[PDB]
Amino acid sequence: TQSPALIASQSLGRCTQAKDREGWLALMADDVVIETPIGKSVTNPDGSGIKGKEAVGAFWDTHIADDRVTVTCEETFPSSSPDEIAHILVAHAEFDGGFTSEVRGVFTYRVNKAGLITNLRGYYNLDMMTFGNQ
């Protein structure tokens, strides 16, 4: 048996690697809060996270859809709750014509009783990102 948290996190990645916008959003609760990273950033403007399914849809359009985002799991850290889990992820992206970005950080997931994602939080900053010219 896979826990609702692990199923959710892995499903989110598969939908990302296939640019399935609708399937991606269906894995989330209507009150989902995405904080990638935690704190103020271009991917987290006010530093309190992207709140709501509409705003995460916009986030997908702005930062994932045409940016070739792919997430790779390096190590999984289960908790003693089936609804919360942590991963060491490596996120890669391609933008502005072919410029690349890559960062490795801790990502925590949380689902509600129905198993829908309510929280996704990333522990990383700019100094951890690496950029490319090909």
Contact pick of 18, 73, 90, 128 for Na ion (by CB under 5 A) = 73
Write out the residues near ligand 3QZ by the rule CB under 6 A: 12-13, 16, 36, 43, 63-64, 69, 71, 89, 91, 93, 101, 103, 107, 122
* Residue from 4, 8, 13, 110 in contact with Na ion (CB under 5 A): 13
The pairing of beta strand 70-78 with beta strand 28-35? unpaired
Our CB check for ligand 3QZ shows the closer of 80 and 84 to be: 84
Tell me which residue of 115, 114, 110 sits closest to 35, measured CA to CA: 110
Contacted by 73, from Na ion, ligand 3QZ, none: CB < 5 to 8 Å by type: Na ion
Task: Please identify which residue in the block is written with the tokens 């809060």.
Answer: 33
Q: How far apart are CA 129 and CA 16, in angstroms?
A: 20
The answer to whether the CB of 69 falls within 8 A of the CB of 12 is no
Q: Which residues make up the interface to Na ion (CB under 5 A)?
A: 13, 73
